[PDB]
Amino acid sequence: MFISVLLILFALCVTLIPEAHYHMVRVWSFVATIIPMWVVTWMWWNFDASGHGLQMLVILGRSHLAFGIDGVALSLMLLTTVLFPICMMLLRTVAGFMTFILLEVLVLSALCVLDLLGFYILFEASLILLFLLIGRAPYGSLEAAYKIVLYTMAGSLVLLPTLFMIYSECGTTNVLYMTCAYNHQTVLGWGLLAVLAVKIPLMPVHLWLPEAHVAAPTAGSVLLAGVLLKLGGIGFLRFMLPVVPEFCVSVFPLVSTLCLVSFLFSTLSTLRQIDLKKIVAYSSIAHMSMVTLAIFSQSEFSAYSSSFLMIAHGLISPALFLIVGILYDRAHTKFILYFSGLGASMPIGSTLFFLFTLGNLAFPLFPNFIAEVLCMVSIFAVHELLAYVFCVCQVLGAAYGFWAFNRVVHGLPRGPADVTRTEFHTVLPLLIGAVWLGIKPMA
């Protein structure tokens, strides 16, 4: 807590640096995100895996805002602290540095909060930052920014009275006493489903993602894909399943059909896309549908497998966004028809593209393979057909993945030259994390 105050105050000192010292501004904003990565690694060192489920607790009196660490929050916090310095390497202005610093404060505090009102306050305080990040004046899109902000606001406004309903019902929004009291679970369950089915892209409230994740800059796309979608999953695992479990059983056919149609229809839409960033953007919806069904199965080790799929997606899809961002930065287009023969002109970039293509399709020696196997073990244990639907549709994911790769990488060599040292080192931590988590993830 004292450490967190010191890290925030060190991060906020970027504004006071005079702008004529360019080197100092770059180094200060990069170190301001490097330090929380070290602190979260130390928190992993301090964790007792044979101890209590909630460790390193702190509660700030009668102000809500109570905090604690479990395994899902700790893995997601480690992933966020990895992803934020890479975002710092892709920005050039103090406005970008400050927006991403404020976003990192809000994400890190939202991932480990234990109060529902605290979760509401901390998460969607990032709405105006996302609006300004997506609708930036010369190269953004105001339509996309309006869509993402309005969908998130709609879901949050459905949740807010139900939050206050359980608060008047039992006397607290602390999740440890909300899980032990008697509450009207249908109303609160519908409010929580309303927020987290927009955060996780679940059809029909999913149309904001294709616009926002493409109109964003490369750093914004890395953040939005790798981090902000998983707040819906940790919302399911931390707040909704412990507090309204009767609802979570009774809504299972509806959540199940939403997940199945989201998976199938989003995979079918990904095949007709002609923009590389839109191809990468749609593929995330099917993965999150598998995550949601694995969470809702509650069957074998469902929290473990679903968290592991969230980590595998958060490693693999930001790297695909990084490669598309390199192509866009040095060729000024994201259109497939302008790219051919990238193997001959960018051999290192095409090799990285192929490896992350194989990772996104859940091939072995990548963490997505272990993730999808364990998620389908959790789904299979409820019924065999709910697993069969995901199993037989694997040709549809590989079709779009290999079609996009084969169209842009082979053929007549036209396009930009190979990657620089900076682009390679933006990609590199994700590759090392993927090789480790896909070969020896546990000990």
Binding site: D48, S50, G51, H52, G53, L176, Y177, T179, C180, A181, P245, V249, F252, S297, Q298, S299, E300, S302, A381, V382, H383
Partner: protein, 152 residues
């Protein structure tokens, strides 16, 4: 009554307030659960968290039992060679029973009961054969198997 429930809650709060433990023991890996006659154990949060820790301990121990028995059964089968059909049925049965306990105890609210031996299926086939005999019609089902796997 309400007064007795209130006095029990006060006693539980006093006990869990003045609780300590040392010498190599982790709290939240308790040796025994707290036995109660409460309707809805979540009425008393300390008892609910204590029994939650005990139940987590048991799930992980059962997983470990499955691994130890799988190593033993592998040793038996690989030593036996082609004689494995009559030599290592008992250890295969014990491994399958341990997997059954590891899956079916504290299973969650949605997963079906896992039969590692096809034992529920063949038990059902026995009962359906017996019912079709008294019904005096042809059995539309297969006849029950004596053993389905290398264990059961």
């Amino acid at each position: 009554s309400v007064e007795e429930r209130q006095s029990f809650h006060d006693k539980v709060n006093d006990v869990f307030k003045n609780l300590t433990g040392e010498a190599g023991k982790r709290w939240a890996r308790p040796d025994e659960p707290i036995l109660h006659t409460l309707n809805d154990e979540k009425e008393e949060p300390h008892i609910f968290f204590h029994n939650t820790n005990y139940r987590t301990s048991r799930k992980y121990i059962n997983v470990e039992k499955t691994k130890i028995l799988r190593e033993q059964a592998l040793e038996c089968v690989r030593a036996a060679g082609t004689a494995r059909y009559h030599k290592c049925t008992e250890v295969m049965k014990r491994l399958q029973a341990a997997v059954r306990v590891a899956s079916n105890v504290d299973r969650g609210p949605l997963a079906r009961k896992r039969d590692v031996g096809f034992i529920y299926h063949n038990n059902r086939l026995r009962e359906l054969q017996q019912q079709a005999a008294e019904l005096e019609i042809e059995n539309p089902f297969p006849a029950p198997a004596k053993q389905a796997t290398g264990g059961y």
